[PDB]
Design an enzyme around this catalytic site. Structure first.
Site, PDB file in Angstrom:
ATOM      1  N   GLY A 159      40.826  36.313  31.783  1.00 45.36           N
ATOM      2  CA  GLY A 159      41.737  35.958  30.730  1.00 45.36           C
ATOM      3  C   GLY A 159      42.310  37.192  30.075  1.00 45.36           C
ATOM      4  O   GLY A 159      41.794  38.301  30.237  1.00 45.36           O
ATOM      5  N   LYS A 194      47.702  20.187  46.812  1.00 44.64           N
ATOM      6  CA  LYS A 194      48.653  19.819  47.853  1.00 44.64           C
ATOM      7  C   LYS A 194      48.039  19.897  49.248  1.00 44.64           C
ATOM      8  O   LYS A 194      48.305  19.033  50.094  1.00 44.64           O
ATOM      9  CB  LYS A 194      49.879  20.725  47.777  1.00 44.64           C
ATOM     10  CG  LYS A 194      51.149  20.109  48.365  1.00 44.64           C
ATOM     11  CD  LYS A 194      51.974  19.439  47.295  1.00 44.64           C
ATOM     12  CE  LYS A 194      53.348  19.048  47.816  1.00 44.64           C
ATOM     13  NZ  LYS A 194      54.187  18.584  46.678  1.00 44.64           N
ATOM     14  N   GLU A 221      39.470  35.559  43.557  1.00 42.69           N
ATOM     15  CA  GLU A 221      40.303  34.413  43.912  1.00 42.69           C
ATOM     16  C   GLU A 221      41.702  34.805  44.388  1.00 42.69           C
ATOM     17  O   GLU A 221      42.449  33.929  44.830  1.00 42.69           O
ATOM     18  CB  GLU A 221      40.433  33.441  42.725  1.00 42.69           C
ATOM     19  CG  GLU A 221      41.257  33.960  41.508  1.00 42.69           C
ATOM     20  CD  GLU A 221      40.444  34.786  40.475  1.00 42.69           C
ATOM     21  OE1 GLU A 221      39.572  35.589  40.874  1.00 42.69           O
ATOM     22  OE2 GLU A 221      40.677  34.607  39.255  1.00 42.69           O
ATOM     23  N   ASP A 242      53.692  13.710  48.775  1.00 42.49           N
ATOM     24  CA  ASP A 242      52.711  13.146  47.850  1.00 42.49           C
ATOM     25  C   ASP A 242      52.838  11.630  47.771  1.00 42.49           C
ATOM     26  O   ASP A 242      51.856  10.910  47.968  1.00 42.49           O
ATOM     27  CB  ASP A 242      52.846  13.788  46.466  1.00 42.49           C
ATOM     28  CG  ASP A 242      52.580  15.301  46.482  1.00 42.49           C
ATOM     29  OD1 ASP A 242      51.986  15.813  47.457  1.00 42.49           O
ATOM     30  OD2 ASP A 242      52.991  15.979  45.516  1.00 42.49           O
ATOM     31  N   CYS A 253      35.832  39.042  35.392  1.00 40.62           N
ATOM     32  CA  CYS A 253      36.544  39.852  34.410  1.00 40.62           C
ATOM     33  C   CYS A 253      36.147  39.471  32.983  1.00 40.62           C
ATOM     34  O   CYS A 253      35.018  39.757  32.572  1.00 40.62           O
ATOM     35  CB  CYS A 253      38.056  39.750  34.662  1.00 40.62           C
ATOM     36  SG  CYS A 253      38.513  40.428  36.350  1.00 40.62           S
ATOM     37  N   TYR A 254      37.045  38.837  32.223  1.00 43.25           N
ATOM     38  CA  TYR A 254      36.679  38.371  30.888  1.00 43.25           C
ATOM     39  C   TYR A 254      35.359  37.597  30.907  1.00 43.25           C
ATOM     40  O   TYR A 254      34.513  37.776  30.024  1.00 43.25           O
ATOM     41  CB  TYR A 254      37.792  37.500  30.305  1.00 43.25           C
ATOM     42  CG  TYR A 254      37.529  37.120  28.870  1.00 43.25           C
ATOM     43  CD1 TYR A 254      37.908  37.964  27.844  1.00 43.25           C
ATOM     44  CD2 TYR A 254      36.879  35.923  28.543  1.00 43.25           C
ATOM     45  CE1 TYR A 254      37.668  37.640  26.515  1.00 43.25           C
ATOM     46  CE2 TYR A 254      36.623  35.586  27.232  1.00 43.25           C
ATOM     47  CZ  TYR A 254      37.022  36.453  26.216  1.00 43.25           C
ATOM     48  OH  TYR A 254      36.785  36.149  24.903  1.00 43.25           O
ATOM     49  N   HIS A 309      39.021  40.257  40.536  1.00 40.68           N
ATOM     50  CA  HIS A 309      39.357  38.857  40.794  1.00 40.68           C
ATOM     51  C   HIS A 309      39.118  38.516  42.262  1.00 40.68           C
ATOM     52  O   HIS A 309      39.935  38.901  43.110  1.00 40.68           O
ATOM     53  CB  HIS A 309      40.819  38.572  40.422  1.00 40.68           C
ATOM     54  CG  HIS A 309      41.066  38.448  38.952  1.00 40.68           C
ATOM     55  ND1 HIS A 309      40.763  37.306  38.240  1.00 40.68           N
ATOM     56  CD2 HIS A 309      41.604  39.317  38.057  1.00 40.68           C
ATOM     57  CE1 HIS A 309      41.099  37.474  36.973  1.00 40.68           C
ATOM     58  NE2 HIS A 309      41.610  38.688  36.833  1.00 40.68           N
TER      59      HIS A 309
END
Lengths: 490, 491
Positions: free
Chosen positions: A53, A343, A171, A227, A79-80, A169
């Site tokens: 964050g 998705k 991700e 979708d 991180c944060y 990070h």
């Protein structure tokens, strides 16, 4: 299902944590950092991930309930989240610029999180590193498990509690081993069973729809997009003839799209589909309109009008089904069975349900359709030319493969032709319109680079469009990336 | 003076390539039709004669050179039809076939003056662009077979006593890998022509012919900015100095700083008298509201002739109109000092004379200029945008090199930007601006052109620079249409 809880401390990439965890076939949910401890315990996670964050843990109200450290489950702070972990468990955080990021090489020692995970040399990770606030003093019971010259405590572990903190990070794919680290935390340290698969999901989702709907009748709008198609297949599997779909062809779809929708739903599955042919009605509303913004407003409003009139006629309906997906949530009752899916899961579910891959794994298609791919005034004449040019481009993308056997259709995020209402000379002399080919590869951060399509692919598409499409005699390829350009031309 | 090669043209579409190959070996040569009278052939005094190919059939055609060429005592090389013609008149025979048929073939050879030491992947083997039409069925008198294929028993023949050679394939096309080596062998070794045809060797002779032609008369010359008229100016200035007056017309449809570069190289560096006309506003006014590309070309051409003619009339003491006419064009009195040169030779002559390489090695530029690169209505507003984008594109082509160190500017035959009067959306905020197309082609020897496979990174950097640096453009495309089915220019 074993589930992972992700607490969001405000980072711009927090959703990628959820995507990675789902990609490991473990269920997970994204909640704000201030989720009350009672709801956390009720969620009963197999592990918790604390995101990054932009704020600073020593001066922010961004504080999760510190009772998360008493649940007896593993916790990973990013991180944060690592700084928060250190701030509340007896360590110290040294201030820096939380906006600064860049590449770094982390050296690790052996631990449960780091063993057997490496880039070019053992115990070495190339990461997308946070250069801001950092842990300056280990919290109680912790050890350093990763370091860089500028960040002495780049990774930390409390072995007793299975608490882990990392200053980069995992991700984002720029951290090459980030996926491997997240998998190691979720699958091995937390022991979460990788049971979240779309074949496993169908029966639970079908049962939830039946309990929710009973004998009620459901209407669903089919845009042609994936979708709503997957929502249709899922709901029809649940309630059969209780579902009615409405398909509107506004004349701005790709070639044969209406036929393909009717074939996969009405013919193959026996879904009741009300087919509205509104080409002429939409073309009449677009006549003489050159402003792209007005074009978008007209098409969107007219589509709502045509769908609303079909809804009114289905008087014994009680549910409006919608293809709402998880990124959207992060008198008729709303039925949204895809609310918990990204998705990519929606695509897998569509195949699992038996929809044709050609209709489920396709590049997203804008609401206004070809309306924003015909520059200036939209006419059936131009839409018909464009559908032919577009189809040739896509044929070649589907039939040309890279060295791994992957098609260029699958390698690109979005590919389409654009009709330019300017004329070029050609050869006997000719004087016809120009088509632009657009193909992009989108990143995880709302940017896109144009695809380095093979020259022979571009050349063959160019030759075929010019020779086979009467009315086009010039083909160009868009070489503008995003930024500074947009993906669509209008 | 020069050892000279004579090329007699029997109508083949590639006869000019024979002349280019001979010039590329630094031997002077001229192209004449097959019916060049025998006394002019002797007066030309060639060291050897080449008989080109052709679509006709030697037994049923009036395409007959004077057979006295076989009594001159000089070597003769016949190519396809030229070989068949040679066989037909020197006691051999030609078997009819389809003169329109061509394709690849492997020719096996034996040792001869023409074939020794020339090979592709195995000794005495040639990969050639073969004529599958009429062929020699019986050797002419004193000739031997020196090359054959399975389907063409007499693919190459030699008369060693007379130094006559005939080949059934086209050595002037690059598809015959050793075709240049074969032509050089005939010209340089069998004919013994001295490779003295160089542009430094040409200057002194060209200066003297101009001085003998013009004397003390005054000359006017139009400077378009193109290499031909520029090199002519430099050469004529070298011959007659202050007797030359150049006229440069800027019609507002030139590339960035074109007028400045032309004045700087001529008026400032060389002291040539140059009449500079700034006609930008006048051309723009005449083009207002005109979108038909054919009318645009007509307006620009007719208006340029008018501005130039009015300047010509004011130079009342002039007797010669000089032009940059070059040899492909040839295959007040007119002064045409470049009539014997190909383009590449003109370029070398421009350097030899001291012109800056950047102005001499330039892509050709159309007469109507940017007028055919601004689609639809031409306005200064659009020309100013296009000149900026075009210059950015050219900067990057000049500054990016391939694996051999050759610039992508030098690798392409023609490169330019095209202004499209359509608007695209962009991005923070939302922009809505015009579209630029990049065009780059590589021309073949056969009036076709493929689009350049520019490196992706180069297209990407040009796109980024144009969108970011050119206020008014927010989208860049690359033309991926070849010729055929498209043209190089868009209008």
């Amino acid at each position: 299902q074993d589930k992972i809880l992700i607490l969001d401390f405000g980072s711009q990439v927090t959703r990628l944590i959820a995507r990675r965890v789902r990609e490991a076939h473990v269920y997970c949910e994204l909640h704000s950092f201030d989720m009350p401890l009672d709801e956390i315990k009720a969620f009963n996670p197999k592990g918790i991930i604390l995101s990054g964050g932009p704020n600073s843990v020593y001066e922010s109200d961004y504080q999760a309930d510190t009772g998360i450290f008493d649940l007896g489950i593993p916790v990973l702070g990013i991180c944060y989240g690592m700084q928060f972990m250190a701030h509340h468990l007896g360590g110290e955080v040294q201030p820096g610029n939380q906006r600064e990021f860049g590449y770094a090489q982390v050296k690790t020692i052996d631990s449960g999180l780091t063993r057997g995970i490496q880039d070019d040399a053992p115990n070495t990770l190339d990461v997308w590193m946070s250069h801001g606030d950092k842990v300056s003093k280990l919290p109680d019971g912790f050890a350093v498990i990763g370091d860089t010259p500028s960040c002495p405590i780049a990774m930390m572990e409390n072995t007793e509690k299975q608490f882990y903190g990392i200053q980069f990070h995992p991700e984002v794919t720029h951290t090459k081993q980030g996926r491997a680290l997240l998998n190691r935390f979720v699958l091995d340290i937390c022991g979460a069973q990788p049971g979240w698969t779309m074949p496993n999901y169908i029966e639970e989702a079908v049962a939830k729809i039946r309990e929710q709907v009973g004998s009620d009748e459901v209407i669903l709008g089919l845009s042609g997009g994936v979708d709503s198609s997957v929502a249709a297949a899922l709901i029809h599997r649940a309630i059969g003839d209780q579902l009615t779909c409405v398909f509107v062809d506004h004349g701005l779809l790709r070639l044969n799209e209406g036929k393909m929708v009717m074939d996969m739903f009405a013919r193959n599955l026996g879904v009741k589909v009300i087919h509205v042919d509104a080409e002429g009605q939409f073309m009449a509303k677009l006549a003489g309109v050159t402003d792209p913004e007005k074009k978008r407003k007209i098409i969107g409003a007219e589509f709502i009008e045509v769908f609303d009139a079909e809804e009114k006629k289905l008087t014994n309906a009680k549910w409006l089904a919608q293809g709402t997906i998880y990124p959207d949530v992060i008198k008729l009752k709303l039925l949204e069975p895809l609310r918990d899916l990204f998705k990519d899961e929606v695509r897998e579910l569509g195949v699992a349900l038996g929809l044709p891959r050609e209709m489920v794994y396709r590049h997203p298609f804008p609401g206004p359709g070809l309306g924003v791919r015909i520059l200036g005034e939209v006419k059936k004449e131009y839409a018909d030319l464009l559908r032919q040019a577009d189809d040739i481009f896509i044929q070649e993308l589907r039939n040309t493969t890279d060295e791994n056997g992957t098609s260029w259709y699958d390698l690109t995020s979005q590919a389409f032709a654009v009709f330019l209402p300017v004329k070029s000379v050609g050869v006997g002399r000719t004087y016809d319109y120009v088509v632009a080919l657009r193909a992009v590869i989108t990143s995880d951060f709302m940017t896109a680079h144009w695809a380095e399509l093979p020259y022979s692919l571009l050349g063959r598409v160019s030759n075929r469009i010019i020779n086979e499409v009467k009315g086009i005699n010039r083909v160009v390829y868009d070489v503008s990336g995003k930024p500074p350009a947009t993906i669509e031309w209008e």
